[PDB]
Amino acid sequence: GVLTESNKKFLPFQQFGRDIADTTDAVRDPQTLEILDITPCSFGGVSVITPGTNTSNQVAVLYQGVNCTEVPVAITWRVYSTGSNVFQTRAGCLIGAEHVNNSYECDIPIGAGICASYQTSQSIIAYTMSLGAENSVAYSNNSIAIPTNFTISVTTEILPVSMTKTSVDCTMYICGDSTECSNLLLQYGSFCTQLNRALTGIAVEQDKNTQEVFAQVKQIYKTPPIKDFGGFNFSQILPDPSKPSKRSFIEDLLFNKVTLADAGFIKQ
Amino acid sequence: AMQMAYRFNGIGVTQNVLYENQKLIANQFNSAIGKIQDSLSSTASALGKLQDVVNQNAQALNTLVKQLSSNFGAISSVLNDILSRLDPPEAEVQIDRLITGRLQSLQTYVTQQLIRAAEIRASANLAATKMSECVLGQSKRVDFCGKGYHLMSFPQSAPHGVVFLHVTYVPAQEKNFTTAPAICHDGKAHFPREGVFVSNGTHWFVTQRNFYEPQIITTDNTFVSGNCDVVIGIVNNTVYDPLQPELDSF
Amino acid sequence: SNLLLQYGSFCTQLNRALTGIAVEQDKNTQEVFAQVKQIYKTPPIKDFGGFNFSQILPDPSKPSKRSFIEDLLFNKVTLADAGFIKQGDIAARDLICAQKFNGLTVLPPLLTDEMIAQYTSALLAGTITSGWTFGAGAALQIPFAMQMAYRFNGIGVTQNVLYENQKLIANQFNSAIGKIQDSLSSTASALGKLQDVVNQNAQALNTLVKQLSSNFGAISSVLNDILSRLDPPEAEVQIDRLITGRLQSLQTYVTQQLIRAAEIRASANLAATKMSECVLGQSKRVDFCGKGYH
Numbered sequence: 048g049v050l051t052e053s054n055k056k057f058l059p060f061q062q063f064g065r066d067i068a069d070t071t072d073a074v075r076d077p078q079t080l081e082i083l084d085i086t087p088c089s090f091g092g093v094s095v096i097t098p099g100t101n102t103s104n105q106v107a108v109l110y111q112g113v114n115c116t117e118v119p120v121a122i123t124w125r126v127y128s129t130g131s132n133v134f135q136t137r138a139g140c141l142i143g144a145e146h147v148n149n150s151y152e153c154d155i156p157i158g159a160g161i162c163a164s165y166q167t168s169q170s171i172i173a174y175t176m177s178l179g180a181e182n183s184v185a186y187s188n189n190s191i192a193i194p195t196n197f198t199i200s201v202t203t204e205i206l207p208v209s210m211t212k213t214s215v216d217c218t219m220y221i222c223g224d225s226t227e228c229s230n231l232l233l234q235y236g237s238f239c240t241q242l243n244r245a246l247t248g249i250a251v252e253q254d255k256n257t258q259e260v261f262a263q264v265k266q267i268y269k270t271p272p273i274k275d276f277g278g279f280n281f282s283q284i285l286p287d288p289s290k291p292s293k294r295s296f297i298e299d300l301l302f303n304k305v306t307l308a309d310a311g312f313i314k315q
Numbered sequence: 316a317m318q319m320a321y322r323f324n325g326i327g328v329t330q331n332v333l334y335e336n337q338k339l340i341a342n343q344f345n346s347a348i349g350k351i352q353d354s355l356s357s358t359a360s361a362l363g364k365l366q367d368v369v370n371q372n373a374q375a376l377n378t379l380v381k382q383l384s385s386n387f388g389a390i391s392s393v394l395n396d397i398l399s400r401l402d403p404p405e406a407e408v409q410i411d412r413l414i415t416g417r418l419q420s421l422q423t424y425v426t427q428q429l430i431r432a433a434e435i436r437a438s439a440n441l442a443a444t445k446m447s448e449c450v451l452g453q454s455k456r457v458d459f460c461g462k463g464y465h466l467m468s469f470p471q472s473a474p475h476g477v478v479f480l481h482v483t484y485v486p487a488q489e490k491n492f493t494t495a496p497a498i499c500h501d502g503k504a505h506f507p508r509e510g511v512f513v514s515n516g517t518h519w520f521v522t523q524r525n526f527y528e529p530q531i532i533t534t535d536n537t538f539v540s541g542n543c544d545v546v547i548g549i550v551n552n553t554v555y556d557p558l559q560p561e562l563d564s565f
Numbered sequence: 566s567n568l569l570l571q572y573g574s575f576c577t578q579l580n581r582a583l584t585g586i587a588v589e590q591d592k593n594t595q596e597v598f599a600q601v602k603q604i605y606k607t608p609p610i611k612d613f614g615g616f617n618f619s620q621i622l623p624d625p626s627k628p629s630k631r632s633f634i635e636d637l638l639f640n641k642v643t644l645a646d647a648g649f650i651k652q653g654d655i656a657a658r659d660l661i662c663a664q665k666f667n668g669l670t671v672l673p674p675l676l677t678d679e680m681i682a683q684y685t686s687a688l689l690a691g692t693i694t695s696g697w698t699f700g701a702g703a704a705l706q707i708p709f710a711m712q713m714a715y716r717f718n719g720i721g722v723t724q725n726v727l728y729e730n731q732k733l734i735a736n737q738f739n740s741a742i743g744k745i746q747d748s749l750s751s752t753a754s755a756l757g758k759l760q761d762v763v764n765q766n767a768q769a770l771n772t773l774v775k776q777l778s779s780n781f782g783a784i785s786s787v788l789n790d791i792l793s794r795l796d797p798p799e800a801e802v803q804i805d806r807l808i809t810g811r812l813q814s815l816q817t818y819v820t821q822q823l824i825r826a827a828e829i830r831a832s833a834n835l836a837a838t839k840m841s842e843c844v845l846g847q848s849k850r851v852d853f854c855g856k857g858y859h
């Protein structure tokens with residue numbers, strides 16, 4: 048830590064001052080009876096603000112909870128600390144991003160109302176994001192606005208219903224194929240039974256979730272062979288009988304869009 | 316068509332609007348459906364919720380697997396290697412260290428899965444409520460079944476999830492009008508039975524609140540209550556009783 | 566650190582969990598408040614048919630455009646730390662100096678209180694100037710008397726009742742707003758639902774910090790003195806005891822924080838639903854938007 052002059056008061060021959068976390072906060076010099084307060088030297092997290100790698104390799108770094116005055120103190124890498132790019136934010140001091148006065152809709156959230164984005168040659172800007180367009184509704188005590196037309200707007204809403212059923216064997220996961228370890232683990236009472244009960248409850252609850260969401264009709268209605276629905280066209284959402292799966296065009300699109308390139312089903 | 320007229324009456328728009336703009340509404344709905352299919356095909360990040368759920372489950376499982384390769388303070392992370400190198404009375408310490416580490420990993424994984432399952436159960440309860448109140452009905456709740464005045468909804472199956480196509484009625488082309496709370500005809504106050512009084516500059520009409528369909532002010536469009544001097548903002552205008560010219564011709 | 570390395574990925578697991586909590590906090594705030602993409606503004610002339618919104622409309626006198634009631638609430642609740650980076654709570658203002666030094670910090674919200682107040686101002690101005698139409702599409706202006714008449718027809722009362730009793734209803738509304746202001750200024754625990762959240766977070770952090778003073782079986786509770794007093798080969802076990810105790814402390818704290826964040830997310834979903842159904846429209850659900858006919 049760092050040592051500094053202290054405005055504290057001590058006993059005639061007191062020694063030091065501890066704090067809440069059982070860490071010494073101040074100390075009296077043994078040689079000369081002078082008191083120093085111990086403040087740990089600067090530390091904090093590091094966040095790297097970047098666009099996509101294909102977009103650019105330029106990055107900006109945010110030293111969280113830190114004014115950049117201790118960046119010259121430790122002046123591992125030090126490439127971007129040349130200066131003229133230092134910006135002070137309430138989320139820490141930002142290095143490598145230009146500050147601009149105007150406002151835009153947020154692209155990369157930094158904190159305390161500051162966002163970063165890649166704009167025009169090309170550089171990373173840091174701005175106080177705008178909450179939205181201004182608007183003064185023409186209110187009057189005798190004026191009204193009435194729609195003379197309309198639009199029919201369809202919007203999507205994706206909701207997760209269930210998740211993957213996983214059941215584990217506690218003993219096998221811990222030390223499968225080990226009699227000595229099986230006997231030793233048996234001394235821990237019923238922990239594996241508790242874990243298996245919890246995971247089985249989750250697995251059954253997944254089926255309950257799916258049933259509650261979907262099985263709300265006891266009769267499987269089907270549309271008539273004549274699609275005379277007043278001109279409305281439901282082909283994209285009605286099932287397509289040609290495919291082996293009796294699901295619609297949009298359903299195929301969704302099932303193809305959801306990718307499991309991670310270890311989800313690759314470990315099948 | 317009659318179902319959609321029922322929905323229009325549900326949102327406060329007279330069914331004559333649908334019966335006169337059926338072709339336009341069908342075209343708009345078909346265009347919206349095509350736009351949805353294009354967006355779902357070309358977005359590549361639309362199913363973010365389901366993708367995140369799958370990624371979280373996979374990441375938790377891989378973390379649980381990788382925890383099998385940690386010493387947890389023991390001589391080695393391989394139980395067979397520990398057993399071969401050490402005789403059982405001293406090997407029990409290493410085996411117990413591994414047992415504690417692996418059991419702690421299992422407990423952490425199970426607690427995380429319980430919390431995530433609670434989250435998924437909340438989302439599934441929301442999805443069931445949305446199914447019941449949008450697919451099986453017409454919800455008056457604002458922003459529940461999409462933005463705008465909800466009309467009807469379509470469910471679509473998704474991997475470990477559900478997709479709702481919320482069809483809504485959005486007012487589009489506004490126009491300014493001069494309005495009054497009531498009308499003075501013969502010392503009486505006429506309030507709109509179902510609609511709003513609007514002036515196009517020189518004449519006073521009665522219009523439904525959600526669509527400009529001006530109509531002449533009559534005794535059918537309005538009800539009488541009180542006198543003129545009490546209502547703040549009342550205006551003088553003629554209220555035409557259809558029975559009076561009929562008995563004039565009589 | 567080397568001794569902790571053999572425990573695997575526990576620290577990165579806890580860091581991921583806490584970061585997820587922190588990001589979903591911003592998600593909750595954005596979901597509740599940023600429900601309008603258009604920042605409406607009240608007209609300079611406040612001719613709202615006798616209704617008085619001055620105590621809920623923003624105050625340009627204050628540097629932050631907060632209403633009188635919003636300022637009352639902010640004075641009422643004494644937060645712990647507002648993300649102020651260290652260059653009557655009586656606990657947190659010194660539990661942000663050493664607590665920060667304990668290798669655990671507090672992040673600032675992405676939306677500043679001024680931005681939250683701007684969302685609130687836009688929502689309230691759009692409401693009082695356009696009824697419920699700004700939540701279904703463009704803001705359609707309408708006199709507030711006629712908007713309230715539409716609300717009366719919604720609750721099943723003829724609009725002639727409002728047009729006959731406009732002065733009385735406006736006076737009652739202003740009196741009720743004044744009563745709310747006086748109750749907020751005089752009360753002690755009306756914002757207890759937020760005070761408990763702040764106190765729970767403070768207690769969790771206090772317990773987590775105080776767990777650094779426990780030996781957990783080691784000779785001392787201070788890592789530096791253990792290392793400076795004993796050689797590595799025998800200090801291994803003392804460091805291991807301290808590591809095990811402090812990892813259990815972090816696991817407990819993070820699990821409690823995850824459960825509490827789930828509770829807060831449920832509350833924020835309820836708040837967003839209440840905003841959508843009560844502020845952006847008129848709700849027929851009984852006792853949802855208050856006691857009575859909404």
Ligand SMILES: *[C@@H]1O[C@H](CO)[C@@H](O[C@@H]2O[C@H](CO)[C@@H](O[C@H]3O[C@H](CO)[C@@H](O)[C@H](O)[C@@H]3O)[C@H](O)[C@H]2NC(C)=O)[C@H](O)[C@H]1NC(C)=O
Binds near residue numbers: 515517
């Ligand atoms: C406000 O709405 C008024 C009613 O819709 C409208 O008055 C109407 O004006 C039109 C002319 O644009 C008249 O149409 C008639 O014009 C001639 C002369 O009267 C006739 O020979 C034709 O056959 C044709 O029917 C309407 O008669 C008249 N409405 C009434 C009830 O007399 C105003 O012009 C509108 N004003 C604005 C500013 O929009």
Ligand SMILES: *[C@@H]1O[C@H](CO)[C@@H](O[C@@H]2O[C@H](CO)[C@@H](O[C@H]3O[C@H](CO)[C@@H](O)[C@H](O)[C@@H]3O)[C@H](O)[C@H]2NC(C)=O)[C@H](O)[C@H]1NC(C)=O
Binds near residue numbers: 499550
């Ligand atoms: C709506 O119609 C009302 C009734 O027709 C009308 O009230 C009438 O107002 C006029 C003048 O504004 C009065 O005429 C006389 O008023 C005073 C008497 O107080 C005389 O000194 C004047 O010289 C003038 O001759 C009518 O007496 C009065 N009618 C009634 C029943 O009180 C409203 O003014 C009309 N409002 C609008 C906006 O058109």
Ligand SMILES: *[C@@H]1O[C@H](CO[C@@H]2O[C@@H](C)[C@@H](O)[C@@H](O)[C@@H]2O)[C@@H](O[C@@H]2O[C@H](CO)[C@@H](O)[C@H](O)[C@H]2NC(C)=O)[C@H](O)[C@H]1NC(C)=O
Binds near residue numbers: 183185489490491
């Ligand atoms: C409805 O009217 C508002 C404003 O009221 C009118 O404004 C005058 C110009 C005149 O037309 C009078 O009849 C009214 O007093 C319109 O809002 C205006 O929009 C324009 C952009 O097109 C903007 O430049 C103005 O500043 C706005 N007015 C105010 C007071 O802010 C609105 O566009 C009108 N709606 C329609 C559908 O025409």
Ligand SMILES: *[C@@H]1O[C@H](CO)[C@@H](O[C@@H]2O[C@H](CO)[C@@H](O)[C@H](O)[C@H]2NC(C)=O)[C@H](O)[C@H]1NC(C)=O
Binds near residue numbers: 195196197198339343
């Ligand atoms: C109401 O809006 C619809 C579309 O929003 C209008 O229909 C369009 O009309 C133009 C010509 O004015 C055509 O070029 C478009 O192809 C039409 N679109 C569709 C989807 O049919 C309609 O004219 C508007 N009606 C009024 C009275 O404003």
Ligand SMILES: *[C@@H]1O[C@H](CO)[C@@H](O[C@@H]2O[C@H](CO)[C@@H](O)[C@H](O)[C@H]2NC(C)=O)[C@H](O)[C@H]1NC(C)=O
Binds near residue numbers: 280281282283
């Ligand atoms: C409903 O929409 C579908 C599109 O999904 C229409 O099918 C298209 O029809 C046109 C003209 O007949 C063809 O050129 C396309 O190749 C078809 N595409 C597909 C995917 O089938 C269908 O015709 C529409 N229904 C009606 C009654 O017009």
Ligand SMILES: *[C@@H]1O[C@H](CO)[C@@H](O[C@@H]2O[C@H](CO)[C@@H](O)[C@H](O)[C@H]2NC(C)=O)[C@H](O)[C@H]1NC(C)=O
Binds near residue numbers: 618619620
């Ligand atoms: C709305 O209410 C506020 C607060 O009650 C009113 O502000 C008062 O105005 C009077 C007249 O200038 C002052 O004497 C009071 O001191 C004000 N009170 C406060 C708390 O500042 C305001 O006037 C009301 N609006 C209208 C249109 O009357």
Ligand SMILES: *[C@@H]1O[C@H](CO)[C@@H](O[C@@H]2O[C@H](CO)[C@@H](O)[C@H](O)[C@H]2NC(C)=O)[C@H](O)[C@H]1NC(C)=O
Binds near residue numbers: 114652
């Ligand atoms: C980061 O460090 C700088 C430099 O020490 C701080 O700037 C000082 O701020 C105080 C606050 O009023 C001024 O009185 C000093 O004159 C400033 N310069 C100095 C001390 O050299 C800055 O405040 C620090 N960051 C934060 C967030 O406090």
Ligand SMILES: *[C@@H]1O[C@H](CO)[C@@H](O)[C@H](O)[C@H]1NC(C)=O
Binds near residue numbers: 078079
């Ligand atoms: C020890 O140091 C202090 C100040 O540095 C001095 O006053 C004192 O005389 C020293 N002790 C002896 C025994 O000289």
Ligand SMILES: *[C@@H]1O[C@H](CO)[C@@H](O)[C@H](O)[C@H]1NC(C)=O
Binds near residue numbers: 101102
């Ligand atoms: C970056 O964008 C280009 C085209 O804009 C695309 O071809 C490339 O695949 C993108 N990078 C990645 C990693 O997908």
Ligand SMILES: *[C@@H]1O[C@H](CO)[C@@H](O)[C@H](O)[C@H]1NC(C)=O
Binds near residue numbers: 147148
């Ligand atoms: C931003 O504004 C500040 C003062 O508001 C000014 O000193 C500075 O030069 C401005 N910078 C740019 C790039 O506009």
Ligand SMILES: *[C@@H]1O[C@H](CO)[C@@H](O)[C@H](O)[C@H]1NC(C)=O
Binds near residue numbers: 547
């Ligand atoms: C509407 O407000 C204006 C303010 O310019 C006022 O002159 C007029 O009398 C008011 N009308 C009503 C009906 O309140």
